Amino acid sequence: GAPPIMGSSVYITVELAIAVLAILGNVLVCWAVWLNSNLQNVTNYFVVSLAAADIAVGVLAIPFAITISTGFCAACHGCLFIACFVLVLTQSSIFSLLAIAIDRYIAIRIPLRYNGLVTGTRAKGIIAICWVLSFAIGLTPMLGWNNCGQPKEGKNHSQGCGEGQVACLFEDVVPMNYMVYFNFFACVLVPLLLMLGVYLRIFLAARRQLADLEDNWETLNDNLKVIEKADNAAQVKDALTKMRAAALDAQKDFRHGFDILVGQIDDALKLANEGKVKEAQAAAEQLKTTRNAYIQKYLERARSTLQKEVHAAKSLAIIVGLFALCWLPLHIINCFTFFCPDCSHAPLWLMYLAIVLSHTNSVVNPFIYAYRIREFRQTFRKIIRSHV
Ligand SMILES: CC(C)CCC[C@@H](C)[C@H]1CC[C@H]2[C@@H]3CC=C4C[C@@H](O)CC[C@]4(C)[C@H]3CC[C@]12C
Ligand SMILES: CC(C)CCC[C@@H](C)[C@H]1CC[C@H]2[C@@H]3CC=C4C[C@@H](O)CC[C@]4(C)[C@H]3CC[C@]12C
Ligand SMILES: CC(C)CCC[C@@H](C)[C@H]1CC[C@H]2[C@@H]3CC=C4C[C@@H](O)CC[C@]4(C)[C@H]3CC[C@]12C
Ligand SMILES: Nc1nc(NCCc2ccc(O)cc2)nc2nc(-c3ccco3)nn12
Ligand SMILES: CCCCCCCC/C=C\CCCCCCCC(=O)O
Ligand SMILES: CCCCCCCC/C=C\CCCCCCCC(=O)O
Ligand SMILES: CCCCCCCC/C=C\CCCCCCCC(=O)O
Ligand SMILES: CCCCCCCC/C=C\CCCCCCCC(=O)O
């Protein structure tokens, strides 16, 4: 077969390219949040945590990946840290991605309580805890779950590594039962499924709330028709009592409108409980004015906020999807290596393609922000133009 350096050269050059783009793209995200106070919210502090992890892929994980591919002689625990530091960074990404999803879930479910519950200080403390935990989880092989105790003694002697040293190769130091059960199933796959669960809930909450505002608007128009074509005063009482409850339902520029509305219903209801039928109908037609000038304005704003939240949650879901798309092939190959001992090992070229693909994830997020979030796009422009 071909000399190692030729395939090695391609892989290294490709990794360096990805490293440059990961650094530049994510430095840009961080600089954007720094300058623009419209981007200075709790959601984006997790985005910055995610960008920092991706900067660290470029600055450290990729140079580590280049190093480990050589199979150089190294002390096994040093080799372990080289092998496992990337797992810290992906774990950090998982936590950041899960925190964004929960944040956007809290925001839709309880918006009036959101700012009181989800603060910068609380967010900052979560980020710190998650980074400590990512170091714990990612470097678990250094705590003793390693193949240092069982070194590949043929490889060690052939390239003359020192006493205590190993030929530094991922699959000779990192156990595959760790990679599959602990790293893939427990640490990646469960939180991804949880994220999917949280996002589907966000879309349900949005659909449910949009339906409520549709139904409250239609009740106001159905019951308005009932008053117009009514036989007696007690029928008008039925339509107004339903209408009054629906007015207080949508209640919880703005507050003056539902005051006029409930006021005018109370006027027509007071007349309907005296048997003044035509006066109650005339007063209930004056609700039309309030409905145009105030209520139609409230509905449109409430509807467009929810549509903005759907659109925002979709954008952030795409990021979770592209994380899964870039990382799954490497995990699936590990599952094949682990669960199928009768299968021949995935070839060297596919191994390195899967490593490269996993690393291109550290490039994609800045693009999704630029395309999908107007505030990031506009800040990107201002930085790029005013800079160089
Ligand atoms: C402060 C940041 C930016 C620098 C990070 C320092 C990095 C480059 C250092 C810290 C610990 C170091 C490792 C510690 C131990 C060994 C074992 C030895 O047999 C070969 C080198 C090797 C594998 C080192 C490689 C470089 C290493 C990973
Ligand atoms: C999330 C989507 C995009 C990932 C698709 C799964 C990919 C990674 C799957 C589909 C077919 C799979 C291959 C099927 C057959 C073999 C032969 C076996 O002897 C070793 C593993 C190997 C080489 C598999 C590696 C992973 C593989 C290439
Ligand atoms: C829920 C989805 C998105 C996550 C992907 C599921 C993963 C865990 C599944 C999908 C395909 C599965 C593989 C399909 C085929 C084989 C070959 C068999 O000889 C041993 C198990 C093994 C290697 C499976 C292990 C688990 C596997 C990799
Ligand atoms: N299995 C695996 N191998 C490697 N590198 C070694 C590639 C290799 C594998 C087998 C072989 O005979 C020669 C070379 N890096 C790897 N990174 C990961 C990984 C990281 C996160 C999830 O999987 N898995 N993984
Ligand atoms: C979206 C993925 C980015 C495009 C990647 C371009 C393809 C080049 C990367 C890997 C090709 C395989 C290189 C040969 C195996 C490496 C040999 C070795 O390291 O010994
Ligand atoms: C911006 C801060 C500067 C940090 C850059 C540190 C420079 C070290 C990076 C790569 C050097 C790796 C050299 C590999 C050693 C070869 C072993 C040998 O000579 O046999
Ligand atoms: C923003 C700048 C920071 C980036 C600095 C990182 C530069 C590292 C570049 C290549 C890593 C060198 C890998 C050494 C291979 C070891 C070969 C061997 O000794 O067998
Ligand atoms: C990102 C670009 C991806 C397009 C090209 C990727 C192709 C990889 C998909 C399947 C590769 C199949 C490898 C053949 C397995 C060899 C069988 C064996 O183990 O001997």
Q: How far is the C-alpha of 69 from the C-alpha of 86, rounded, in Å?
A: 14
Question: Considering only CA atoms, which of 300, 306, 358 is closest in space to residue 329?
Answer: 358
Ligand 1 atom nearest 72 alpha carbon: 20
| Residues contacting residue 193 through CB under 8 Å, at least 6 positions apart | none
Q: How far is the C-alpha of 268 from the C-alpha of 279, rounded, in Å?
A: 7
Cβ-in-10-Å burial (0-12, 13-18, 19+) of 388 comes to exposed
Total length of the chain: 388
Is there an atom of ligand 1 within 6 Å of 78 CB? yes
How do 73-75 and 165-167 pair as beta strands?
Answer: antiparallel
DSSP summary character for residue 110 = S
354: CA distance to ligand 1 center in Å? 25
Cβ atoms within 10 A of the Cβ of 347, count? 9
Cβ-in-10-Å burial (0-12, 13-18, 19+) of 385 comes to exposed
Q: How far is the C-alpha of 43 from the C-alpha of 99, rounded, in Å?
A: 8
Tokens of residue 316, six digits = 């952030």
3-state secondary structure of 167: strand
Compute CA distances 350 → 28, 72, 234, 300, 358, whole Å: 32, 21, 78, 52, 12
3-state secondary structure of 165: strand
Q: How far is the C-alpha of 10 from the C-alpha of 368, rounded, in Å?
A: 28
| Residues contacting residue 311 through CB under 8 Å, at least 6 positions apart | none
In which residue ranges of the chain is CATH 1.20.120.10 found?
A: 211-300
Q: How far is the C-alpha of 384 from the C-alpha of 293, rounded, in Å?
A: 43
Question: Considering only CA atoms, which of 388, 370, 371 is closest in space to residue 32?
Answer: 370
Question: Considering only CA atoms, which of 221, 222, 213 is closest in space to residue 249?
Answer: 213
H helices of the chain, in order, are: 4-35, 42-56, 62-70, 76-109, 114-117, 120-138, 153-158, 170-173, 176-177, 190-228, 233-251, 254-272, 277-285, 287-290, 296-339, 348-359, 361-372, 374-387
Question: Which of 333, 353, 357 to mutate for ligand 5's pocket (most ligand atoms within 8 Å of CB)?
Answer: 353
In which residue ranges of the chain is CATH 1.20.1070.10 found?
A: 1-210+301-388
Q: How far is the C-alpha of 340 from the C-alpha of 337, rounded, in Å?
A: 6
47: CA distance to ligand 2 center in Å? 31
- Ligand nearest to the Cα of 359, by number: 5
Q: How far is the C-alpha of 23 from the C-alpha of 31, rounded, in Å?
A: 12
Is there an atom of ligand 4 within 6 Å of 83 CB? no
- Residue 343: alpha-carbon gap to chain centroid: 36
Cross-strand partners of 54:
none
**CA Rg value for the chain:** 30
Do 176 and 334 form a contact (C-beta atoms < 8 A)? yes
> Which one of 1.20.1070.10, 3.40.718.10, 3.40.50.1220, 1.10.3720.10 gives the CATH number of domain 1-210+301-388?
1.20.1070.10
3-state secondary structure of 166: strand
Is there an atom of ligand 1 within 6 Å of 62 CB? no
- Ligand nearest to the Cα of 20, by number: 7
Question: Considering only CA atoms, which of 128, 47, 61 is closest in space to residue 93?
Answer: 47
Ligand 3 atom nearest 189 alpha carbon: 4
Phi–psi pair at 349, nearest 5 degrees = -60, -40
Tokens of residue 128, six digits = 């710190």
> Which one of 1.20.120.10, 1.25.40.340, 3.30.565.10, 1.10.10.60 gives the CATH number of domain 211-300?
1.20.120.10
Question: Considering only CA atoms, which of 141, 50, 154, 54 is closest in space to residue 95?
Answer: 50
Is there an atom of ligand 7 within 6 Å of 72 CB? yes
The region that residue 174 occupies, defined by phi over 0 for left and psi between -120 and 50 for alpha, beta otherwise, is beta
Cβ atoms within 10 A of the Cβ of 254, count? 11
Q: How far is the C-alpha of 356 from the C-alpha of 116, rounded, in Å?
A: 42
- Residue 348: alpha-carbon gap to chain centroid: 33
Question: Which of 82, 135, 169 to mutate for ligand 1's pocket (most ligand atoms within 8 Å of CB)?
Answer: 82
2: CA distance to ligand 7 center in Å? 24
Tokens 């992890």 sit at which residue?
53
Give kind and range of the element (H or E) at residue 74.
Answer: strand 73-75
Do 57 and 22 form a contact (C-beta atoms < 8 A)? yes
| Residues contacting residue 195 through CB under 8 Å, at least 6 positions apart | 97, 98, 101, 320
3-state secondary structure of 159: coil
Name the experimental technique.
X-ray
Is there an atom of ligand 7 within 6 Å of 59 CB? yes
Three-point CA angle 43, 369, 121, nearest 5°: 15
Is there an atom of ligand 8 within 6 Å of 144 CB? no
Is there an atom of ligand 4 within 6 Å of 185 CB? no
Cross-strand partners of 167:
73
Q: How many CA atoms lie within 13 A of 234 on its CB side?
A: 0
Phi–psi pair at 152, nearest 5 degrees = -70, 90
322: CA distance to ligand 3 center in Å? 19
Compute CA distances 115 → 41, 103, 130, whole Å: 10, 11, 21
DSSP summary character for residue 274 = T
Ligand 5 atom nearest 12 alpha carbon: 19
Compute CA distances 309 → 47, 202, 203, 315, 377, whole Å: 17, 9, 9, 10, 18
Cβ atoms within 10 A of the Cβ of 225, count? 10
Is there an atom of ligand 3 within 6 Å of 203 CB? no
First to last CA, the chain: 47
Ligand 8 atom nearest 346 alpha carbon: 19
* Entry resolution (Å): 2.8
Ligand 1 atom nearest 64 alpha carbon: 28
Cβ-in-10-Å burial (0-12, 13-18, 19+) of 206 comes to middle
Three-point CA angle 252, 253, 259, nearest 5°: 55
